Amino acid sequence: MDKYDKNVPSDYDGLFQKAADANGVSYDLLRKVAWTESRFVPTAKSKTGPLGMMQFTKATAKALGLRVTDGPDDDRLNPELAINAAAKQLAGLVGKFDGDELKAALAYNQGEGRLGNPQLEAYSKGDFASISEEGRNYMRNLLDVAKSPMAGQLETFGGITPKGKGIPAEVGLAGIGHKQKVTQELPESTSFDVKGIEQEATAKPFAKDFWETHGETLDEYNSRSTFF
Amino acid sequence: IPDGAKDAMKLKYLQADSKDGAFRTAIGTMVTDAGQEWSAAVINGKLPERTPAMDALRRIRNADPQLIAALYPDQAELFLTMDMMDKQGIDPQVILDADRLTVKRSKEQRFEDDKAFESALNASKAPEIARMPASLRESARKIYDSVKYRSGNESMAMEQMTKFLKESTYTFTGDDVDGDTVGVIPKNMMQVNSDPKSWEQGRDILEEARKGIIASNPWITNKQLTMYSQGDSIYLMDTTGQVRVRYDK
Amino acid sequence: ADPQLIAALYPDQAELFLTMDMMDKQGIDPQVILDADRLTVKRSKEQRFEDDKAFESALNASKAPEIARMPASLRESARKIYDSVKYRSGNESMAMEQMTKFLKESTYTFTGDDVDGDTVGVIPKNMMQVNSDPKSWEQGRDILEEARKGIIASNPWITNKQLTMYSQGDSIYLMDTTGQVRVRYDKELLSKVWSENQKKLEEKAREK
């Protein structure tokens, strides 16, 4: 997973354009958010591990106003309605932040409340020091595809010199990793299949064979032949 | 390679394998399933519509009889009994009934049953019944047990067995023999045509054969040969076994 | 759900369930089986042989054809009834009379022409009913008696022109010596045959 694969052959993206047009969200932002949350991975295992493309939590899933209490313990497993709900939430966030502010809407990552309101206030003041590390990293990951008036102030935050640019963790730690030594190539078993010689069919009884070849039974034959 | 060569190689590897090896473990599922099929059929009194394990094991036996007899004697004996019944034209329900009658009976009662059956046979007047070979006696006992199990009549079972055996077997006689009987052969094993009445021709060819062998080997004990039907063959044999002649249809 | 699998894996429970099924179809409470097992369990292997010999000798010396030539499967249930009565009292004569009276009025013995011993099978009466009325057992017997005469005519090659009649579970089997001729009947088929015969008879009476 490098550079988000912008121009990779788009796998299972027959849903983002429709949600984007329905709700007004940018296609690139929605696709990038989905990639960041789940990397389009069908399993998406974690502490909670929602395998859906939008890696929600139970509290957010219920607060979204859906019927989550259905199906396999959670209804937001079918991709289309979960993606549509996420797009609606993103559109509501973008619209409510005075214009096309595509990065304050990343309150989507932190929410609004005891831990999200002060960070949004700090973002409004332009004071990125009061935003958490998780929020700062999450906004840094979206700088390529986002339209914001503070997109240039965030990139020049954390530079080694005041004229430098900060380094996102996806770039500073890029390329450092180890391959898995275990693969899904399973060992195969073989059946002990010996197809020998077919068994001979059951014969007719001697009396039945006699009565079918000759129109009379053995007793009649013996009685008639012994008359003379 | 053709399938026969593949079967031969697989059976060579099966024979060379050790007691708890993987080759014997793979085919042990077949034997376990076949035994379970037969035991369940005996308990329920009816064979199921499908017995894949018994069919597979029987085909493997047809490929190599000695290996199966060496490794799984019980299934080999069962298959030999089924083969004899099949050649007589008897449905496996008879074997099921005989097994059902015998299984519900203690070891002390089985001895009494065997003694009673042997006494009833030895007291008969027909030569084919009073001096029956043991291999034929097993199938006769199964027929008698089936008839005695499905009804309560032992007299009916005896008459049914005797009538079935009289009209389907032929007893050969010798000159100056105590008891006069030298063997009993089923009639359909002496047929020279598809016509059952041709059994009389094949008997003649047999009767001149044992007279011709005795003339060629006058040194045999009492100038006597025994005639024994095994599988699909008829054996003319003397006392020492040095003179042995095989015939088939 | 699956009888053959249970018989293959757990034979003891399968045999127990078959015995309970036969008792249930006869209308007998499991307390009889419990009493018979209680009588047998407190008895050594040497005494069980003597008990079996005595019971078989008592049966073979009877005068009723249903008792002297009883099939083994019916003999097991008869032995259980006899053992229960002989266990709850001390009277073996009472147990014998109770067993014989119970078996006389609930079973029917079929006979054949020129058969040594004359018996070809014993069938419980309630397995030959064509209605809910018990007295209808006589109709289902007739349908059976004409069946075995019709099969013998169609298959004259059978050993002595004789068939055995055997009741297993809820079915009645007409079978020859070799097993090549086997015919199955049940209360549904007996009822259907009886209904067809009644329709034919009533239409013949109406239109003639």
Swiss-Prot record, chain A:
Parts forming coiled coils: none
Active site, per annotation: 37
Cellular compartment(s): Virion; Host cell inner membrane
Region (Transglycosylase SLT-type domain) location: 24-111
Family in the record: Belongs to the transglycosylase Slt family.
Domain characteristics, as noted in the entry: The N-terminus contains the transglycosylase activity (Potential). The C-terminus is essential for the viral DNA translocation into the host cytoplasm.
Quaternary data: Homotetramer. Interacts with gp15; after ejection the gp15-gp16 complex composed of a gp15 octamer and a gp16 tetramer probably binds both the viral DNA and the host inner membrane.
Purpose of the protein: Component of the cylindrical core that assembles on the inner surface of the capsid during capsid formation and plays a role in viral DNA ejection into the host cell. The inner core is composed of stacked rings of gp14, gp15 and gp16 proteins. Following binding to the host cell surface, the internal core is diassembled and gp16 is ejected along with gp14 and gp15 into the infected cell. Gp16 probably inserts in the host inner membrane and remains associated with gp15.
Protein name as it appears in the record: Peptidoglycan transglycosylase gp16
Organism lineage: Viruses, Duplodnaviria, Heunggongvirae, Uroviricota, Caudoviricetes
Residue window of the full protein shown: 1 to 228 of 1318
UniProtKB/Swiss-Prot annotation, chain B:
Subcellular location(s) of the protein: Virion; Host periplasm
Function noted in UniProt: Component of the cylindrical core that assembles on the inner surface of the capsid during capsid formation and plays a role in viral DNA ejection into the host cell. The inner core is composed of stacked rings of gp14, gp15 and gp16 proteins. Following binding to the host cell surface, the internal core is disassembled and gp15 is ejected along with gp14 and gp16 into the infected cell. Gp15 probably remains associated with gp16.
Family, per entry: Belongs to the T7virus internal virion protein gp15 family.
Description of how the protein assembles with itself and partners: Homooctamer. Interacts with gp16; after ejection the gp15-gp16 complex composed of a gp15 octamer and a gp16 tetramer probably binds both the viral DNA and the host inner membrane. Interacts with gp14.
Name of protein: Internal virion protein gp15
First and last residues shown, out of full length: 437 to 685 of 747
